[PDB]
């Protein structure tokens, strides 16, 4: 998504990114439909 939004490290083949109510953003897993606090693009907590 060059230019039109997308100013960060692209999410892996089966991943996304959405902010939660907890106060921090997580990483959605499309491979198994899940979520995590640590990004897969690298492996560090959001």
């Amino acid at each position: 998504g060059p230019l039109g939004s997308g100013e960060e490290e692209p999410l892996p083949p089966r991943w996304s990114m959405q902010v939660a109510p907890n106060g921090r953003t997580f990483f959605i897993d499309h491979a198994s439909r899940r979520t995590t606090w640590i990004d897969p693009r690298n492996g560090r907590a959001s």
Partner: peptide, 11 residues
């Protein structure tokens, strides 16, 4: 904790 598993964060 939080972290809305794949089911809630889909709005």
């Amino acid at each position: 904790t939080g972290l809305p598993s794949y089911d809630e964060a889909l709005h």
